[PDB]
Amino acid sequence: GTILLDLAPEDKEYQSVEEEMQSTIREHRDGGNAGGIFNRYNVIRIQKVVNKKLRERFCHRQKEVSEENHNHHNERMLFHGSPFINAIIHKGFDERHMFGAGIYFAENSSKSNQYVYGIGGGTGCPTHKDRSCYICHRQMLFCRVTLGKSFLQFSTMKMAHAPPGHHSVIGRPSVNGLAYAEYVIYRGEQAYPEYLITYQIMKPE
Ligand SMILES: [Zn+2]
């Protein structure tokens, strides 16, 4: 099944992942209700997710998307937060579980952090029922996402699948619209859970 390889903090690969995670934190419109109040994360560990079958499924779909998009799969590295992280690293993303019934990714780690415990932070951490828990270790993924031909929009366009000839939907920010970008796929084989990040949000002074 799945192997989790720990990255060393002194390794450039670990530093690249942590840097992308910390530098993409932003202030949210809810003032921190969903994901908590913090300026920085405390990274516990970063693991690379290895699974032969998941990799086959992802590479097979990447080839189809490339053929349908002028020989360009159009991959982006993006964050994902959800209460299904354990099922994802063993079974892969599954669409069966704003732009409708898709799988959502963000370029801002703090946006994904808002979904780690569910919609609007759900009921918070399982132990303390705290959306802003500074104690419990959280996890998010930093994924390879096959976007192919993306359908860009500034406002809600609810769909069950990407529009004809397209492979993903992108919600772009605008004043009066979305605060931050979101990337949506409608097939789980269009994302690979490359990195598993275990962390805490830090309580500011
Ligand atoms: Zn907790």
Residue numbers in the entry: 1105 to 1201, 1207 to 1314
Question: What text comes from the article?
Answer:
Poly(ADP-ribosyl) polymerases (PARPs) are a subgroup of four enzymes (PARP1, PARP2, PARP5a, and PARP5b; PARP5a and PARP5b are also known as tankyrase1 [TNKS1] and tankyrase2 [TNKS2], respectively) that continue the reaction (PARylation) to generate long chains of linear and branched poly-ADP-ribose (PAR) on target proteins. PARP1 is involved in repairing single-stranded DNA breaks making its inhibition an attractive strategy in oncology especially in those cancers that have defects in additional repair pathways. Thus, TNKS activity promotes Wnt/β-catenin pathway, and TNKSs are potential drug targets for the treatment of cancers driven by Wnt/β-catenin pathway, most notably colorectal cancers. We determined crystal structures of the catalytic domain of PARP1 and the ART domain of TNKS1 in the absence and the presence of the ligands.
TNKS1, on the other hand, does not contain the helical domain, and its NAD+/ligand-binding site is seen to be more solvent exposed in isolated ART domain structures. The second difference is in the nature of the donor loop (D-loop); in PARP1, it is longer and more rigid than in TNKS1. In contrast, in apo-TNKS1, the D-loop is dynamic, potentially occluding the ligand-binding site, and must remodel for ligand recognition. Perhaps consistent with this logic, ligand recognition induces a rotamer change in the Phe1188 side chain of TNKS1. The TNKS1 D-loop on the other hand is shorter, relatively flexible, and shows multiple conformations of its glycine-rich region (residues 1201–1211). Nevertheless, we conjecture that the base of the loop is significantly more rigid because it plays a pivotal role in dimerization. Glu1199 and Arg1200 at the base of the D-loop are involved in ion pair interactions with charged sidechains of the dimeric partner. The net outcome is a smaller and more restrictive ligand-binding site in TNKS1 relative to that in PARP1.
